[PDB]
Amino acid sequence: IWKGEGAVVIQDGQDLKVVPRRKCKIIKDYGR
Amino acid sequence: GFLDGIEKAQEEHEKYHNNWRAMAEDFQIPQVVAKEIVAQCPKCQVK
Amino acid sequence: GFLDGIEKAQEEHEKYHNNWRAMAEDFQIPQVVAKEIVAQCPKCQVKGEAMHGQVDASPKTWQMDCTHLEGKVIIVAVHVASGYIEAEVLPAETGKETAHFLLKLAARWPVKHLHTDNGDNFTSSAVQAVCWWAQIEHTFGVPYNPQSQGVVESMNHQLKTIITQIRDQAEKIETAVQMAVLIHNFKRKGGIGGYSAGERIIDIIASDLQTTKLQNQISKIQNFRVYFREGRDQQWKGPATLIWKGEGAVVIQDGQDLKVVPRRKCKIIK
Amino acid sequence: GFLDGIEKAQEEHEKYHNNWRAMAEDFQIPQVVAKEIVAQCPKCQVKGEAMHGQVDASPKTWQMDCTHLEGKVIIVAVHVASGYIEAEVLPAETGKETAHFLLKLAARWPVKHLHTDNGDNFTSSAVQAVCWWAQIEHTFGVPYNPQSQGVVESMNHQLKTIITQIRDQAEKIETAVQMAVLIHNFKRKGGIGGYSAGERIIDIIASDLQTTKLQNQISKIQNFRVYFREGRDQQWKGPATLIWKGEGAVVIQDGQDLKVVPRRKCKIIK
Amino acid sequence: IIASDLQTTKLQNQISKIQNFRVYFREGRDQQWKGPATLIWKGEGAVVIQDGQDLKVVPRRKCKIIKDY
Amino acid sequence: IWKGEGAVVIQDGQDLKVVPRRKCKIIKDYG
Amino acid sequence: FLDGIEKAQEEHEKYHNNWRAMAEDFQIPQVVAKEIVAQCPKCQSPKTWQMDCTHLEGKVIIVAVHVASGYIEAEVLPAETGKETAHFLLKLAARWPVKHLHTDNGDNFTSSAVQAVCWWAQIEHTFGVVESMNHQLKTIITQIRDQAEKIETAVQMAVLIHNFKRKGGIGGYSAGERIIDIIASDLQTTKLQNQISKIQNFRVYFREGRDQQWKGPATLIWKGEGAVVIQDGQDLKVVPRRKCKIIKDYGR
DNA sequence: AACTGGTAGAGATTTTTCTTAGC
DNA sequence: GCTAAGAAAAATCTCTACCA
DNA sequence: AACTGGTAGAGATTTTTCTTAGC
DNA sequence: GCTAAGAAAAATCTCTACCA
Ligand SMILES: C[C@@H]1CCO[C@H]2Cn3cc(C(=O)NCc4ccc(F)cc4F)c(=O)c(O)c3C(=O)N12
Ligand SMILES: C[C@@H]1CCO[C@H]2Cn3cc(C(=O)NCc4ccc(F)cc4F)c(=O)c(O)c3C(=O)N12
Ligand SMILES: [Cl-]
Ligand SMILES: [Cl-]
Ligand SMILES: [Mg+2]
Ligand SMILES: [Mg+2]
Ligand SMILES: [Mg+2]
Ligand SMILES: [Mg+2]
Ligand SMILES: [Zn+2]
Ligand SMILES: [Zn+2]
Ligand SMILES: [Zn+2]
Numbered sequence A: 001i002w003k004g005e006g007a008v009v010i011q012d013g014q015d016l017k018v019v020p021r022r023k024c025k026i027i028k029d030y031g032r
Numbered sequence B: 001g002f003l004d005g006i007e008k009a010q011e012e013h014e015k016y017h018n019n020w021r022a023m024a025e026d027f028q029i030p031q032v033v034a035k036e037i038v039a040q041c042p043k044c045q046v047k
Numbered sequence C, D: 001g002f003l004d005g006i007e008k009a010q011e012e013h014e015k016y017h018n019n020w021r022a023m024a025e026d027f028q029i030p031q032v033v034a035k036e037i038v039a040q041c042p043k044c045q046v047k048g049e050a051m052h053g054q055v056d057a058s059p060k061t062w063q064m065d066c067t068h069l070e071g072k073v074i075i076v077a078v079h080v081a082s083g084y085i086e087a088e089v090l091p092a093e094t095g096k097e098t099a100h101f102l103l104k105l106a107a108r109w110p111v112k113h114l115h116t117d118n119g120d121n122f123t124s125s126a127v128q129a130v131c132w133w134a135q136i137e138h139t140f141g142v143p144y145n146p147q148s149q150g151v152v153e154s155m156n157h158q159l160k161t162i163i164t165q166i167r168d169q170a171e172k173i174e175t176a177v178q179m180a181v182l183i184h185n186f187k188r189k190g191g192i193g194g195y196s197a198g199e200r201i202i203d204i205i206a207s208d209l210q211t212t213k214l215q216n217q218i219s220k221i222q223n224f225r226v227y228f229r230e231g232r233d234q235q236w237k238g239p240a241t242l243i244w245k246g247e248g249a250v251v252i253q254d255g256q257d258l259k260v261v262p263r264r265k266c267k268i269i270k
Numbered sequence E: 001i002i003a004s005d006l007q008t009t010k011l012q013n014q015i016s017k018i019q020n021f022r023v024y025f026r027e028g029r030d031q032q033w034k035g036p037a038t039l040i041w042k043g044e045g046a047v048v049i050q051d052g053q054d055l056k057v058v059p060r061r062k063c064k065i066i067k068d069y
Numbered sequence F: 001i002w003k004g005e006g007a008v009v010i011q012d013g014q015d016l017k018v019v020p021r022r023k024c025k026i027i028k029d030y031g
Numbered sequence G: 001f002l003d004g005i006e007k008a009q010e011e012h013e014k015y016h017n018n019w020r021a022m023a024e025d026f027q028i029p030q031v032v033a034k035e036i037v038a039q040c041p042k043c044q045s046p047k048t049w050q051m052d053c054t055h056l057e058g059k060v061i062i063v064a065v066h067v068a069s070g071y072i073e074a075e076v077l078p079a080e081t082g083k084e085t086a087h088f089l090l091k092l093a094a095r096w097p098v099k100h101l102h103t104d105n106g107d108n109f110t111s112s113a114v115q116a117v118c119w120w121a122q123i124e125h126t127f128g129v130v131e132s133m134n135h136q137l138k139t140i141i142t143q144i145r146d147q148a149e150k151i152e153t154a155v156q157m158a159v160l161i162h163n164f165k166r167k168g169g170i171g172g173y174s175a176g177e178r179i180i181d182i183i184a185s186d187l188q189t190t191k192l193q194n195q196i197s198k199i200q201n202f203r204v205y206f207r208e209g210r211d212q213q214w215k216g217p218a219t220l221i222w223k224g225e226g227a228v229v230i231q232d233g234q235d236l237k238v239v240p241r242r243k244c245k246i247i248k249d250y251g252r
Numbered sequence H, J: 001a002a003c004t005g006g007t008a009g010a011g012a013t014t015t016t017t018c019t020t021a022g023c
Numbered sequence I, K: 001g002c003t004a005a006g007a008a009a010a011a012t013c014t015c016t017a018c019c020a
């Protein structure tokens, strides 16, 4: 949802959560 | 141009279900539109 | 996806003739596809490429043009490497007076290359016969492109400003033209070496003659053949003449071509 | 010495009109004397100073001009800070149609300053009466200097290229003019913010209104008077309003003038 | 028979992707933009174009060269 | 360094290079 | 360096060389060798032209010859009045540096128009090679006459053949190489003279070795990076820069 | 397939030179 | 006696109009 | 004493992003 | 699992014609 400098906001299971960037891997998604 | 290449690549993936690097090298279209042609098919997965 | 966006963008450019940023923002297609949609249109594509060239500046190149002043016809010739002006007043703009002016100029100074525009007097049989008899290479510019002969039109501007400066000291216009030629050639300094135009043309031609005689006397008694190794493939080429051996690279002459080879890929044989 | 050189250089410039480097090299006088000899001559001094100005770009300034295309008369008005074009086809070039076009434009958009050239239709009693009734400040350019209204002549060039692009889709020339206005205003992007002209004029006017209302609400409840010490002499001036206190400098308002004072030369009194 | 056809098609593809250009130029007294042509020689300053079996020399400041992707 | 027929070898800032003949002016520059 | 100056002074004392040869041989700069020549008591034109008129097949030709090289400029006049001779002199003075003109005591050369042209162009006119040049030009004109229709084309073709195609003399050069070399040598001399006066507007106080007194004001000749050449008492000497003080001298 | 913009002057800014006060 | 501040004078860099 | 050149596109060059081989 | 090479794609900088 939002990619910050040190924080990352994700949506999962109708829930929003904030994970720091050193525990996350961002990939592209071709899921049309 | 390669707009007719995009049309022929859509027909070719509709028949034979190629991958994206093969269509990008054969029809001389860029890699983004070839990956999108693979992505909009429900049976194939880009890898 | 954006394939329907590509089809709608093609119909949108067919009606409205957008640029690529409008299509890439409104239809969310990548910029390479939008640039291709614009680049495959014939009603677009109206723009140059924004660069300038560089004219010939050999030590024996002259440029010629004609101009009008107070109902007269002036003909101007300029030596390009120095800025040296010869000018005359013609009674008419035919080809016979142009051939006569070219013959006088070729009888005074060494001319080997002449550059002109495509006027009716420069493209004539009389000028062609004079160029054949005096062995001059005549070249023409691209039609309706006055930037090819930039030096002679710039000297037209300078000559007209000088003529307006010293106009009240003469009765006729031919006297004022010759006084303007003298004032330009010998009474204005500044440029490459702080010279005037007469000192610069003397320096250029004398230096050319002296350096040809010096390198003839040097190269007639040479030695030290050099075999070098160059190219994409590690091959070996024929005998070349060593010219100058310096700290870092060597200068060789092969097939009347000058090359600079590093010191690691060459071998000297006496 | 060189005093006889100075006298001979004055007579030489009186006859030949040298530049200063020729006299400073031939007569061995210093360069300040040669520059003075050239600078005290009236037949010389023909050159500008090689700089450009910058036109007004207030958020309510408009510029207007007329042009010709296929035997018709187009009148173009441009909003300067955004690039927004209104254009019409006039049956004649009199002052009544220009006053009517100006009245329609002033009835649509907020106009407070108008800039034009010195044509026969813009300098008229009808345009003066419309400007008086609608409270518009009308200014004119320096005569025979088209660079003062640079934006409207540039938009004349862009409008003519668009009209040549979409010419075969219309029957008359008025339809082609209005289609070119639509294509320019809404189908071309790129510029300051990546906007088109319509999005940019909306953004500019809305931002101006919002920032006036915000700073009115801020400045109606302010406090913290500030006495500062500035000038060439260490004097003291009257009460000024503190606006913003930052690390390094403070911003004060005194006599409806904004100033930036360093933090050492000011004192805050509640 | 098939392998030599593969080598011939690869070499023809390279030769076809060398010099497939189009040129939109501007020439004449009334300097209007004209249709496509074929580029022959490209020097620094001017280009030589083939158009309607006519050879023309246009400066690079008055022409636009479209390549292929 | 050397003046050929269609090329000129010059040394500039201890760097040797080859320029065409139509892009050079060779003088002695008394001054 | 100092050995080079001593060898150059002894060589000039024996053989009286010129300054270009000494500067090339003994590897001293040009201003020092020019001062060595300028101090010798036993050692103390490129802009002179001659004009004449002639007749050929009913036409009036006018010939101007640069004397020191043999360089010919010719023209065909419509008449023999003073205004056409003044126009030819103005064109000649506008193309080449003319400083001293030599003519005969004809009618058209003694005229108010020619005197006004000489006044405006600053030429010294003197009334008395050209007959030999007229003879040689008429031989070339009768040699290539069948290749032209009019007489002006034949005159200009003979001028071209004489200037650039006939070689002779000591080195085997034509007339154009001779006139260009002569004028270039004169230009080099004038530039060196300007540098000489601009350097010699100074003065030097120098301190000898094993002494704390400053010596007399010697005239500066060459100011190097680490050496200074001065003239004092008709003697040239080289002092290093850390024992010298250079001041201006207003001693006109 | 082998062609092409340039010249000179006005100010602004950086570097060199020349005189003099101070320790 | 030596050195640094300060001002004058010379050198260099950027930008414009006009040439049919 | 209160006036003034600008807009958009074509290439060249530098920066960011995306896929894959190798340890 | 992690990292660096390499290539595609997007962003920025410099320069030109035309506006009576
Ligand atoms: C009939 C001949 C042959 C066919 O072309 C015409 C018209 N022409 C026009 C200009 C001209 O427009 N000069 C101004 C100018 C403008 C821009 C620039 F970059 C350089 C410039 F000199 C000339 O100088 C010129 O000589 C001619 C000419 O001779 N002719
Ligand atoms: C009779 C009115 C009032 C008196 O002046 C004339 C002539 N004029 C001439 C141009 C013109 O030359 N435009 C080309 C152009 C050239 C250079 C530049 F920097 C900008 C440019 F637009 C105009 O645009 C224009 O409007 C007028 C005009 O209106 N008039
Ligand atoms: Cl032309
Ligand atoms: Cl005006
Ligand atoms: Mg012409
Ligand atoms: Mg011309
Ligand atoms: Mg107008
Ligand atoms: Mg206008
Ligand atoms: Zn599929
Ligand atoms: Zn289009
Ligand atoms: Zn003057």
Ligand SMILES: [Zn+2]
Pocket: G012, G016, G017, G037, G040, G041, G042, G043
């Ligand atoms: Zn002697």
